[PDB]
Amino acid sequence: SYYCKKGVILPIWEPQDPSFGDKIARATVYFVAMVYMFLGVSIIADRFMSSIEVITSQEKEITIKKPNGETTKTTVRIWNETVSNLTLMALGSSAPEILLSVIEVCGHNFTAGDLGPSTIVGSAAFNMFIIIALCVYVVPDGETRKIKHLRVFFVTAAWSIFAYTWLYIILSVISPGVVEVWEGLLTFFFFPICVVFAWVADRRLLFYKYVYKRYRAGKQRGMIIEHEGDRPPVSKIFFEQGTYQCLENCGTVALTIIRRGGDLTNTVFVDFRTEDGTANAGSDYEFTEGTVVFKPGDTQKEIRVGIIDDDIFEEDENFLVHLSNVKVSSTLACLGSPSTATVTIFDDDHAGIFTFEEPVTHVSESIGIMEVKVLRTSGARGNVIVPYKTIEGTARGGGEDFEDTCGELEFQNDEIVKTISVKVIDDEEYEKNKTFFLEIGEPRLVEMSEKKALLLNELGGFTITGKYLFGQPVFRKVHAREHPILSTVITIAPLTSKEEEERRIAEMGRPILGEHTKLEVIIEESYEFKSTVDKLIKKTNSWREQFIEAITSCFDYVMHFLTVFWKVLFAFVPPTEYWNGWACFIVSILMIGLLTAFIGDLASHFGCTIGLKDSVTAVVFVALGTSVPDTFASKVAATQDQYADASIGNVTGSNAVNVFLGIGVAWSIAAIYHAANGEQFKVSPGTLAFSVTLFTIFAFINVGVLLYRRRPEIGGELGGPRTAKLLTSCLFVLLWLLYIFFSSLEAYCHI
C-alpha cells in the first residue's frame, strides 16, 4: 500500500500519494536518514558493549618493580572470555533488534507489525551466513581457526536454529495465526535457559579455571582480554658362537650348530643336552635333549631351548649345552671346538626405580593444569603404589597459588610413566616468583604372584585377581581402606640356605625411589601477560578526553566528518570508569532505544512511500544495519583469538537472544495486554512462516559446510587454504542473496 501509518515519533509526510517524482524525493530523504541512523547506532552500540565489558571484568592493580627506587603503579582490567561473558556481549550487540521489536509493538498500540519480527528473522540470515562468511575470510592466509569445543557448539547451534523453528510452531502448529499468553512467556523463558547453560558450561563443560590462558590487549584504555590457548681335514661339528645371550621373556633361545670341513655329501649325527649351571632346569629353563641330523649339502642346524619366564627378581644366570656322540651313517666326523655353549639369561623382573625427570621445574601461573611425569627406571614388573603429596613453600597454596593434591599413583605391569596433575591458580601478576614442592613417598608392591609372595615373605591378605601373568594366578594385596568379603582374601604366608639366597635376591627387586624424589616447582608470571601490560604502558578529566577525541588520510577525513555529529553527541555519555561501567550502561541503552525508535519510523515510512513491504525492508535494510555491531565483534574474535569458538558463538548467541528476548518479550507484552481485554493476539503466520523455514534449510547447509571444513585438508572452520577459503565465503554470500530474494518474492506472492 501507499498509505503510511503515523509512527512513534515522526509525523506522516503529507499529502500522501503525491506524484511519482515526489516519491523519489521523499524516499531519498527516508533512506539517507535511515542510513545515518544506522551509522549512529553502530557507534553507540560499540560504546554500550564496551560498558558491558567493564562491568563483567575484574579490576587489578599492577605493581611494576624497577631497579631504581621509583616503581610506577598501574591499574588494568582483565575480561575473562567465557561463554557466560560472551553471551552477555552477544546480548549487548543485539539490543537494536531486541528494542525495535518491543518498541514497535508497544508504540503502535500492541498490534503485531511486520517490521520487528522480520528484522529478527532477517538478522539471523545476515548473522548466520554473511557474518560467518566474513569471519572465514578475515583469518590470515595459512592460519586456521578450529572449534575446539564441539560439544558446546552442537548444543548452542541447535538451540539457536530451534529458536526460529519454535517461532514457526506457535504461529502455524499450535493455535495457528494467534499467539497465546503461555506461548509468549515460554518464548521468553527460553532466554534464562541460555544463561544457565552458559554458567554450567564454564564450570563443567569447559573447565575454564584450568585451561591454558592467553592475554591480548582489549579495545579500551586499560582493558586486557584473557582467553583460552593451547598449552605448550675331516669334518668337525661345533657351536657357532660358544656363548649365547638371552632375556628371560624370550621364550626360546637360538643356538646354531655348524658342521664344517671334510665332505658335505655325507650324513652326520650329533647329540645335544642341557646341563644345569647357575640356572636350574625346570625353574629357569626347560630341559631339552635331542639329536641333530646333518643332511648331504647341509652345514648348519638351529636348535631351540625354552626359557621359563616368571615374576621374581634374579641375578644373571647361566646353563650349559653340550654336544656329544658324533656319528656317521654308512673318523670322518669329529667333535670340534667350541663343543659347549653357555647360555646366559638376563632377568627383567625388577619392580622399578621411581624418580622425577628434573629436580627443579619452572611453570607460569597461567598453565592451568601442570602435569609432572614420574618415571619408572630399570624394570617395570608388577603393580606398584607410589604415594605423592604437595608441600607448601613460598607459594602458600590452598587455592591461593595452587590447589593441594595428594594420593597414590598405581603403576601397572610394564608401565614406565605416570603423571601428576596439580592445579595452579592464575592471579595476573606482572612479576611473580613463588615456590612449592611435590614429593613422592616409599613405593609399595601391591600385586604379585603366589610364589613371589613366598619369596618376599609377604604376611598380608591377598585377593585373587582374574588376571593371569606368566601362566600363574595374580594376587593383589588388601589395603585397610578396602573392605572385602573376608572369604575372598587369602593369607599366602629350616631353610636350606639356597632358598634363603633365593629370597635375598628377590628382595633386591622390590620398588625403590630414584635420584629425584622431591620436585621444587617455581611459579612465575606469564610472559604473555607481562608483554601485554608492556604493550599498554607504551601507549596509554576523562570527560574532557572524550570531547577532544570526538573532533580530530583523505579516507579518514571522509569518515571523520561523516560521524563527527555522532561522536560529539555520544561524548556526553558518561565515561565508563564511573559507577564501574553502569553510568555508561544506563545512558547508552537509552540512546540505543531512542535511535531504534527513529529507525522503526524511518524504515516504516520508507517502505510505504515507494510501496515496499515492511517484510522486505526489514530483511534487506534493517537486518543488515542492526547487525553491524555483531559483525565487528565476531571479526575481531576471528582474527585475534586462536580458536573459532568466540567468533562463531557470537553469531549463535546473537541468533538465540534475538528470538527469545526480541520476540519473546514483545509478544509477551502484547499477548498479556490483549488477554486483560479478553481478546486474542493475532499474528499473521504466512509472512513469517516461509522465512523461518527458508532459514533453517539454509542454516543446516551452513552448519554442514562448517563441519566439513574440519578435515585435515582444510583444517578448521575459519581461514584454511585460500582456494577453499573463497568457495566457503562465496557460498555463504550466495545463501544470503538466495534467502533475501526468495523471501522478497514470497512476500509479494510470487511463490
Epitope: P387, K389, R444, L445, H479
Partner: antibody, heavy 121, light 110 residues
Framework: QVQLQQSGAELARPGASVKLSCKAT????????MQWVKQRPGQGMEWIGA????????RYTQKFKGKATLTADKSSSTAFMQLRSLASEDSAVYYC??????????????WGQGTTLTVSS | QAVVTQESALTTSPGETVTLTCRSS?????????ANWVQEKPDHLFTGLIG???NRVPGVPARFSGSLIGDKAALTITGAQTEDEAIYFC?????????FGGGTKLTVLG
Amino acid sequence: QVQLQQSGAELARPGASVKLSCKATGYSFTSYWMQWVKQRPGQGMEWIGAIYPGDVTSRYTQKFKGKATLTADKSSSTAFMQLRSLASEDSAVYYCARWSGYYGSSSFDYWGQGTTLTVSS
Amino acid sequence: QAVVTQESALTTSPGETVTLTCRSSTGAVTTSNYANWVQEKPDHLFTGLIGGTNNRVPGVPARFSGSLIGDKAALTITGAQTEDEAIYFCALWYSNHWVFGGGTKLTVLG
C-alpha cells in the same frame, strides 16, 4: 596429640621367643609407617625395620631379616615385633617411631617410651 | 655395611652456637642420604628433630637447623639452651637401610 605406648619390661630365657607391642594413638595408624629401632649401651642404635600396616608392607635389615618379624593389628591400632631364638646380644631397649612415608620429612617423628628386654638365665 | 662417625661429646655454654658432624664411611654425605637428626633426653626420651637434611619437625624449636658442610652432614644449634643437654644421633639412608651415628653427648653448663 600423637602417642606411641609400649609394653613393659620383659625377661626371656635364651633360645626362646618374645613379642613386643606398640599401640599408636592420635593419628591414622594404617596410613603411616612404623619404625622399629634397637638400642644397646655402647653400641649406638641399630635400625631393625619398618612396617606399613595398611598393606602390611615391610622393610628389614639383612641381619634382622630372620631374627625379627614385624606384624600389625589395625583393628586395635597396634604394631608388633617378634624376636625368635633369643641370645645374650638381644638384651636391649626397643623403640617404635612414626614415619610419614616420605624421606624429606623426619623418619623418626614420634618415639615410644622404649621396652627393655633382658635375655639371661 | 657403612659406619657413621660422630664426635664423642661436645661442651658449650648457654647462648652459644654449636655444630655437630655426621660423617659417612663410604664417602661424602649427599642429599640422597637423607640425614636425620634425633635427640635423646635423659631416661630414654627420644625426639625426632630434623629429617631430609633440611626439614625440621613441627614443634621443634627454631634454633635447630640441619645442613651439609663439606662432605658431611651437620646440625647447628644457635643460642643453645640449658635444656638442650642431650645425646644427638644422626641417621643416614643408604640403599635399603638406615645407619645411626654413635651419638654426641652434648652438655650445656649451668
